[PDB]
Structure formats: C-alpha cells, structure tokens
C-alpha cells in the first residue's frame, strides 16, 4: 500500500476539495465524524482506501489532505462545515491577505511568507506515510493563489520529493463563470513554471462544466456547488483506481505510463457520461454502448474541442457500475466504424479499460441522479491544444499594449517573465502540431 497526499490551493482548489472528500466519504462509507463501521482493522491497515485516509486509535479516518489559501474565509467554511471533524487543524492553512488575482502576488510577495509553513505541514503528513506515492494538486489557472502559489509549491515539491509523482486537477478560466480580467495572464504564467514539475495534469474548463449543468441538469444558472459536485464525480472516477481494488492505474506512475508518452504533452482530455438531472422523474437507463458512444461527443468533454481534428496518443476507459468486458468490446467495435478515431502512427490504436462494479455514488439531495453505469474516458489528444490556442490569443491581445503588466512588475516580477512564459506556450502549441500533423 502506497499513500497519496492531496493538496488544495486557492478558493477553487479548496471548494473542489470539499466536494471530493464529501464524495470519498460517501463512497467508502465514512461518516462525517471519521468513523467507518465497515472497517474492521481499527488503528491501521494497508487497504486501498488507506491511500487517501490515515487512521487513529479511536477508529477515526483522516484524509491525507492539506488545504492552503492566502485568505481565511473559504477554508473557514471547512472548519465549520459538515465534515469539520474530518480534518485536523494543521491540515488547514490560511493567510490574511490574498493574491488579488495577481500571479506575482501569489508566487513572489505573499508566497515566500507562507511557503515554508506549508511544506512543514505537508512534511508531517509525509512522515506518516510508509511509502508515499506522490501528490494530487487541486487549483485554478486564473486565481492569484491558485496560479501563483501553486507554481511555487510545485517547485519546492520537486526539490523535497524529487522521486514522487505529481498530478494536477486544474480549472481552466471561463468568462461566464466569475473571472478576473487578468486570468489569461495568470494561466500562462503558472503553466510555464509548472510545466516541468507536473507528470500528468487534468484540465477542467469551467465553460464546459457550466454548459453541461445547464443542458443536462436543467440548472439555468449553475453555482459553484453545482459545478464542483459534477467535477468531483470526474475526479472520483480518475482516483477510484487508487482508492479501490483493481489492476489499472493502481499508482500515480501508471497515469504517466498509460496516458503520457511525451513529458510536455501531459494534458489528457476527460469525457464523462452520463449526466442526468435528479429532478427528472421518468428516466431511462443508458446502456454500455450508449455511454461509451457519448465519450466521443464534444458536449460531454471537460474541455470543449474537436478530437476529430487531432490525433490520439492514448485512451483509457473508466467504467463504474453494471458493466462487463463483453459489452465494452461490442461498443468499441461499433464506435470505430461510425466515429472518426485517428491515432498517431507511432502508437498502438487501442483502449485500456477499467471496470469497477460499484456504481457511482451521488450526494443525497444533489443535482445528479443515481445511474447504474457511468464512464470516464481519459484520452491524450492533440485536440486539447485548441484550449491553449485561445488562451494564448487572449494573452497576446492584452500584452501587446502591456495592459495590467504594472500590477505584476510592482510585485517584483519582470516583463521578461511574461515573454518567457509565452514563448514556452508557443513551443507547447508547436509540440502538439508536430504530433498531430478564386476558382
């Protein structure tokens, strides 16, 4: 058994962390007080759920998690929330003055003041691990803390834990879901500095989640609670193999092995199905073929793009519920004849499949209905570079006039870092192109 430590940075990271650990406790049958009746080995054990939860003498299951934000009000909600007993005080770290949507403020100014405290608190969780796998980092691209402090943390983690793997769950900025005007700046800056420190990163575009909540859940104006509960489901699907007994993606290293052939191209596309509103009285359960077919519909992706105009490097199918290998193959065979699935001519055109018989758990009184079978597809496709293209375009527009740059320079940053970050993104876009090549 090898442990996994989760780190949640900024408002987005923390609030998503809340939704995930709420779901984890429901999936593993852990009560808000930390008591887990189904667990019989009191005080320890090396079960699969011990990868995320440590144990105390009182039969209390404590999340191997650390919440960090440069401002107290968000994490203070955790200190008083439903799962307040779940976390030890040292796991929750707060400042007094945030990064004001400024990467420079989060990375340099406020960052250095609290970075050493965070590492020591993380070190304490690490010392309780017999064999640490690595880290799961949750943060936003746009936020000053989620971009600024995260990139600083990723650097120090690579120093103090050079052998361990690091995975990201990153929130891509969407103007419709409460953004700062300088979020394109923060996104490019944090990506450039984190790029060589992340082995695998799952991007989640707020735009995609927002539309899915409107289209499939009939929520006219989705809140963060609506968005996070959906995101937690996708997150849960990805981390299920680490928390439950299985053979596929059993450790953090396997994610890199199965999804990321080239180190820089480590942003797999995630697609989830099905998403059904709980308010829907009469619902007909979708089959294996139907939910598998939906994995190739752009309206179900975590990032809006067209995989038909790219090339696959790897594909992983994560099923939960009433699913058997026979029905999976029959579904794939049908899909390969209807859909446009082109792989790179240096990779095996295939699908690695994982099935967990336990159907998806839903939050009581939530927006999602309980289904009998669901699937999350992880596919490393060059099509996701579209997201980089539009993000870099917004960057270029503002930076041409050097708008808002003074806010960053005023925090000790230099104009050179802006251009330095952009060129790396230019190289990153170019890397995707090399792979997925009147009248």
């Amino acid at each position: 058994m090898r442990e996994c430590i989760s780190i949640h940075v900024g408002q987005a990271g923390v609030q998503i962390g809340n939704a995930c650990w709420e779901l984890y406790c429901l999936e593993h049958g852990i009560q808000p007080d930390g008591q887990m009746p189904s667990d019989k080995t009191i005080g320890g054990g090396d079960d699969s759920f011990n990868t995320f939860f440590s144990e105390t003498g009182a039969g209390k299951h404590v999340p191997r998690a650390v919440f960090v934000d440069l401002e107290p009000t968000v994490i203070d909600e955790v200190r008083t929330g439903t799962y307040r007993q779940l976390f030890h005080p040292e796991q929750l770290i707060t400042g007094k003055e945030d990064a004001a949507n400024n990467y420079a403020r989060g990375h340099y100014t406020i960052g250095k003041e609290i970075i050493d405290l965070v590492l020591d608190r993380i070190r304490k969780l690490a010392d309780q691990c017999t064999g640490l796998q690595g880290f799961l980092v949750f943060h936003s691209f746009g936020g000053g803390t989620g971009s600024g402090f995260t990139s600083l943390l990723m650097e120090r983690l690579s120093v103090d834990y050079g052998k361990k793997s690091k995975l990201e769950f990153s929130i891509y900025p969407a103007p419709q879901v409460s953004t700062a005007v300088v979020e394109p700046y923060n996104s490019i800056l944090t990506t450039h500095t984190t790029l060589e420190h992340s082995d695998c990163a799952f991007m989640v575009d707020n735009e995609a989640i927002y539309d899915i909540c409107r289209r499939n859940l009939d929520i006219e104006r989705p809140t963060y609670t609506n968005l996070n509960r959906l995101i937690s489901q996708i997150v849960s699907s990805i981390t299920a193999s680490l928390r439950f007994d299985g053979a596929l993606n059993v450790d953090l290293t396997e994610f890199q092995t199965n999804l990321v052939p080239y180190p820089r191209i480590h942003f797999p596309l995630a697609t989830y199905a099905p998403v059904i509103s709980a308010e829907k009285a009469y619902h007909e359960q979708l089959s294996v073929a139907e939910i598998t077919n939906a994995c190739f519909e752009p309206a179900n992706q975590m990032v809006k793009c067209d995989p038909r105009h790219g090339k696959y490097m790897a594909c992983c199918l994560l099923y939960r519920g009433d699913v058997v290998p026979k029905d999976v193959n029959a579904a794939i065979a049908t899909i390969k004849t209807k859909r446009s699935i082109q792989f790179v001519d240096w990779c095996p055109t295939g699908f690695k499949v994982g099935i967990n018989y336990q159907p998806p758990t839903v939050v009581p009184g939530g927006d999602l209905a309980k289904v009998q079978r669901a699937v999350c597809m992880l596919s490393n496709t060059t099509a996701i570079a579209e997201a980089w293209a539009r993000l870099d375009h917004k960057f270029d527009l503002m930076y041409a006039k050097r708008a808002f740059v003074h806010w960053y320079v005023g925090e000790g940053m230099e104009e050179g870092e802006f251009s330095e970050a952009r060129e790396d993104m230019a190289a990153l876009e170019k890397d995707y192109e090399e792979v997925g090549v009147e009248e």
Partner: protein, 55 residues
C-alpha cells in the same frame, strides 16, 4: 480485435483492447535567489517612492 491482460477481482476487472498495431529541476538555492531577487526589486521601488515623497 484482441483482448489482453484481463485481471478479475471481486470489485471489478480491467483489460486492454488492441485494434491496430503502430506503424534537471532547479535547486533550492536557485529558487531562493529568484524569490529574493524579486523582493529586492520591490524594496527598491518602494525606496524610490519614499524618496520621492521625501522630496
């Protein structure tokens, strides 16, 4: 359409389906340097401000 590496347990199973065959991190020192370099630039600009206000 081949099915390889089928692993069955009591919580589920996993396998692989082949359809078509193929055809120097920065040190702690250097990070401290960058963080302190930006701090000096902040202190410099603040000093320039206080000098200006002194005038």
């Amino acid at each position: 359409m081949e099915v390889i590496e089928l692993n069955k347990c009591t919580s589920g199973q996993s396998f692989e389906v082949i359809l078509k065959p193929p055809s120097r991190d920065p040190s702690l020192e250097e990070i401290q340097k960058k963080l302190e370099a930006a701090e000096e630039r902040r202190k410099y600009q603040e000093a320039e401000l206080l000098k200006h206000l002194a005038e």
